[PDB]
Ligand binder design. Sequence first.
Ligand SMILES: NNc1nc2c(N)ncnc2n1[C@@H]1O[C@H](CO)[C@@H](O)[C@H]1O
Length: 338
Amino acid sequence: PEMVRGQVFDVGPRYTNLSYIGEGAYGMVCSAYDNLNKVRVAIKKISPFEHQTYCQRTLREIKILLRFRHENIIGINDIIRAPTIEQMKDVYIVQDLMETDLYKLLKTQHLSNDHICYFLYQILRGLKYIHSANVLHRDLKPSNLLLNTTCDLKICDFGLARVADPDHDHTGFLTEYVATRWYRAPEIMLNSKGYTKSIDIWSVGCILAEMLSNRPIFPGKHYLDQLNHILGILGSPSQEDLNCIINLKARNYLLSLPHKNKVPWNRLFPNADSKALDLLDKMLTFNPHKRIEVEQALAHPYLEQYYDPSDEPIAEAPFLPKEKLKELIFEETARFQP
Ligand SMILES: NNc1nc2c(N)ncnc2n1[C@@H]1O[C@H](CO)[C@@H](O)[C@H]1O
């Protein structure tokens, strides 16, 4: 078997000429030559079977991506694993080879307003499909957005995704949460489990702000610090918005803070398109009930050059210990045998 960086990466004989790309949430990622389709591909090696939560994320990623079919969501082209459960220790997911991700791109490249507009259009177009399937991505951030050489954008990594459940979204103040801190909506720290679609719109708002300046807008250093970054820009929530927070611990925390004025978007982003900042304001709305939804965002004037609801498709239908989960992962990957 071909090896890379001292560890096994046996994808052959179909995939050859391996090249290491990097280390991701699951393990090692390489590019390789697909001898059948005569193209290079990306392959990620996943080794989850020791742990409930690892097997959880792997099953979510595989199940969702195999059911979704959308130009702005990465597909699964192939899955490589041993022929038997007994012999299966690793799973390799084969996907289209992209040129970069938005995290790497924003480290070194200034985006033109035309690129910002096109990227945001594609994020929202993909998210319209995700949300139409009743699925929440719950971890949108630049490193989960891949781009090819012609700047086609694909949403990746559904390992933290969930089916939306707005009737069970309420929780207490400072409830623990898993998704990435800088892209977390304020209500996560206050009273929300992140089971409603507005959680994803907040993340997209954060991504838009980061495309405008090449810096995260809310770079909190720890859990409650994240909220104090958000409030330092949005300012103090209104009485109406506080009245929507019935939980006393969360409400009284906000009431305990000195008054903070809103920082105007055009002061933070003096080079930005004014229509972009209008949409940014609507995505980064404190009250999740007032926050713009994905289909309204697509119809915003900023996106007028691209908006076409007939070309923004929706999903055909809405969407346990490790031993049962290994069995599920084995079952979910059977179609690629062999
Ligand atoms: N799962 N990640 C990933 N998928 C890729 C793909 N389909 N095409 C190109 N690069 C891909 N990466 C890169 O691998 C590294 C570790 O995550 C990072 O640098 C990513 O950008």
